[PDB]
Ligand binder design. Structure first.
Ligand code: HEM
Ligand code: HEM
Ligand SMILES: c1cn(-c2ccc(O[C@H]3CCCN(Cc4ccc5c(c4)OCO5)C3)cc2)cn1
Ligand SMILES: c1cn(-c2ccc(O[C@H]3CCCN(Cc4ccc5c(c4)OCO5)C3)cc2)cn1
Lengths: 298, 298
C-alpha cells in the first residue's frame, strides 16, 4: 500500500519555487479545465502571470473565484465527508487580508452568525491568510469553533486537555457541564489570544418529562489546513450541519435546527443540482499547535 | 544474581484481576506520590474508581495525564538510555482509540512529521491501544520506524531477514543500498499490512571530495512494549536523536540535524530543568511478532 499522509505539518521557510511552480500550474489547469473548451487564452494568460508573480515575490495570490473553486473541490475531495455530495452549497468568506487576532475574532463571529442563521444552518468556510515562510501562520487552536469545556469528568471529556490549556492561558473556568470554550486565536505567528464567544452567537438545542441536557447546533471544524496549487492555508474554519431514546432528532426538528434527515438530504442536493446551467485541493489535518508553538512569552 | 527478564511476551487471556489490581494500585500511588503532600483525596478517589472499573470490565483506562507520566517514568527507568537524563522533554501522542492499520499508519506519519521537525529533532512517543485479551494486539513489526532494507549484502545487513519478510508480504524490492523499508502494521491482532512511508517524510543527512553515502536523521524504536500499572502497550513507537574520518558530526551539524553534541546536551538538559516550578513503568523488549503470529491468511 502507498497511502499518503493526511497531515500537513509546519514549515520554517517558504516553499521552494521549484516545488511551488509545478503545483501552481497544475491547479490553474484544473481550474481552467472546469470551463471545458472555453477560455484557452485566459488560461495561458493566467499561467504567465502566476509564473511571473512567483518568480518576483516567491509566491502568488489566488483570484477570489479560484479560491472559491478550491474550497469546493477540497470538499468534493474529502473522503469521509457525507456532505460533499452537495459540494456547491458553500459560502466563502475571504479573510486573506486579515492581520490581527482581534480581526480573526470578528471574522469568526461573522461566520458563526451567517452559518447559524437562527437554526436554518448554512455551510460556510472562512479563509485566512496563506502561509508565507511558516513563521507567521494564522491558526485556530480550537478543534471546533463551538465545543463544551472538559474538566472523573465534567463537560466534554474530549477537551479536558484543551480546557486545561485555556485555563493556563488566563481563561476563567466556570465549572458547568456546558461551558462554551473560548476561541484561541493565533495571528501572524504570534502567541494565541483568548476570546470568549458572545453567548448570543451560540445556538443550542434543548432536549425534550428535566436532566438539563442541551447541545450546540453548529458543528464547525476549526483546525484543518487547505492546500491548493502548492499554497497552504493553515487557518480556514468551515461548518456543515449534523447527521443525527434519541430525543435529538426530535429536539432538533422541533426547534427547527437543520440536520441531515431525508428532507434536508433531498433539498440540499436539489439546490446543489440547480447550481448547474495525491488529491489537490485538499483539507489536511495539522499537528496540534500547542505542541509546536514557540512561545515569545509564556 | 536475580536479574529480571527484559522481555515481555504474548498472552492468550486477559490479565487476572488478582494480578492486575495490585499493580494498578501501586502505579496510582506512584502517580499521586508525584504530588507529595497534595491530593490525598483525589488519590483515594482514583483508587476507588479504578478498582471498580477493573471489577466491572476486567481492566481499566489511564487518564491522559497518567499516561503521560507513565511514558516519562518508563524513559527515566530505561537503564541504557543516555537521553533519559532529560526525560521531561517528551511529546506524547494518544492513539489509544486507534482501531485499524490505516489509522495506525496516519498516526505514525504524524509522529514522523512532528519528531523530524525539518531536522530540529523532537522526542515523541505514540501510544496505541493497550493489550486486552492478547489476541487483539496492535504491533509494529519493524524494529525502527525508518530503516534501510537489507538484501554478500546490499543495504542494511541487519535487516536482511525483515526485508525478506516484507517481500514475502508483497512489498516490491527496489534493490538499492538505501531503500527505506515499509511500515508493517498489525491492528487488533489482524495480519499485518504493508505501508510505504511517504519519501518526503524521510529526512536524510547526505555525507560531505562522491561515494553516494547518506543516512536517515530520525532514530525511532518501533517494537517495544510499555508496561504500566499492570497494563501492557505492545505498540508504542518512540524516538530520540543520534548520539554520534567521521563526516557524520560534520554532515549532521552542517545540515542542522540534531545530534547529542555538548550544545544539544546542555540545551536539552536546560529545557528539561526548566520543566520544574522490578521497575515499573518500563519499556520491555518483545518476541519478534512474525515468530509468534497466527496467520488468518498466508
Ligand atoms: C453540509 C453538511 C455537511 C455534512 C452533513 C457533513 C458531514 C460530515 C461527516 C459525517 C464527516 C465525518 C466525521 C467523522 O468521521 O468523525 C465529515 C468529515 C469532514 N467534512 Fe463534512 N459535512 C458537511 C459539510 C462540510 C463542509 C462545508 C466542508 C468543507 C468545505 C466539509 C469538510 C469535511 C472534511 C474535510 C472532513 C474530513 C473528511 C476526511 O477526513 O475524509 N464538510 N463531514
Ligand atoms: C532524546 C534523545 C535520546 C537519546 C540521545 C537516546 C539515546 C539512547 C542510547 C544511546 C541508547 C542505547 C542504544 C544501544 O545500547 O544500542 C538508548 C536506548 C533506549 N532508549 Fe533512548 N535516547 C533518546 C530518547 C529516548 C526516548 C524518547 C525514549 C523513550 C520515551 C527512549 C527509550 C530508550 C529505551 C527504552 C532504550 C533501551 C534501554 C535499555 O534497554 O536499557 N530513548 N537510547
Ligand atoms: C462538517 C462539520 N464536520 C464536523 C464537525 C464537528 C466534528 O466534531 C467531532 C467531535 C465532536 C462531536 N462531533 C459530532 C458530529 C458528528 C457528525 C457530524 C458532525 C458532528 O458535524 C457534521 O456531521 C464530531 C467533526 C466533524 C464535518 N464536516
Ligand atoms: C531513542 C532511539 N533509540 C534507538 C534508535 C535506533 C536504534 O537502532 C539501533 C540499530 C540501528 C542503528 N542504530 C544506531 C544508533 C546509535 C545510537 C543512537 C541511536 C541510533 O538513536 C539514539 O542513539 C542503533 C537503537 C536505539 C534509543 N532511544
Amino acid at each position: 500500500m502507498n497511502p499518503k499522509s493526511l497531515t500537513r505539518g509546519p514549515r520554517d521557510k517558504p516553499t521552494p519555487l521549484e516545488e511551488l511552480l509545478p503545483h501552481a500550474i497544475e491547479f490553474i489547469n484544473q481550474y481552467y479545465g472546469s470551463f471545458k473548451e472555453a477560455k484557452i487564452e485566459e488560461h495561458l494568460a493566467r499561467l504567465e502571470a502566476v509564473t511571473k508573480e512567483i518568480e518576483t515575490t516567491g509566491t502568488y495570490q489566488l483570484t477570489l473565484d479560484e479560491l472559491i473553486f478550491a474550497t469546493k473541490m477540497a470538499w468534493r475531495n474529502a473522503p469521509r465527508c457525507i456532505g460533499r455530495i452537495q459540494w456547491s452549497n458553500l459560502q466563502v468568506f475571504d479573510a486573506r487580508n486579515c492581520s490581527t487576532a482581534q480581526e480573526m475574532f470578528q471574522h469568526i463571529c461573522r461566520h458563526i452568525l451567517y452559518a447559524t442563521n437562527n437554526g436554518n444552518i448554512r455551510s460556510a468556510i472562512t479563509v485566512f491568510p496563506q502561509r508565507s515562510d511558516g513563521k507567521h501562520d494564522f491558526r485556530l487552536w480550537n478543534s471546533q469553533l463551538i465545543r463544551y469545556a472538559g474538566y472523573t469528568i465534567r463537560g466534554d471529556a474530549a477537551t479536558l486537555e484543551f480546557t486545561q490549556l485555556c485555563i493556563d492561558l488566563g481563561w476563567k473556568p466556570r465549572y458547568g457541564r456546558f461551558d462554551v470554550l473560548p476561541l484561541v486565536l493565533q495571528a501572524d505567528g504570534q502567541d494565541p489570544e483568548v476570546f470568549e464567544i458572545p453567548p448570543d452567537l451560540v445556538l443550542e438545542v434543548t432536549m425534550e418529562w428535566e436532566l438539563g441536557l442541551k447541545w450546540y447546533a453548529l458543528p464547525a471544524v476549526a483546525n484543518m489546513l487547505l492546500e491548493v496549487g502548492g499554497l497552504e492555508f493553515p487557518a480556514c474554519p468551515f461548518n456543515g450541519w449534523y447527521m443525527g431514546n434519541v430525543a435529538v432528532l426530535h429536539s432538533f426538528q422541533k426547534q427547527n435546527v437543520t440536520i441531515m434527515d431525508h428532507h434536508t438530504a433531498s433539498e440540499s442536493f436539489m439546490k446543489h443540482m440547480q447550481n448547474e446551467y495525491v488529491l489537490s485541493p485538499f483539507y489536511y489535518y495539522q499537528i496540534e499547535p500547542w505542541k509546536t508553538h514557540i512561545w515569545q512569552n509564556e
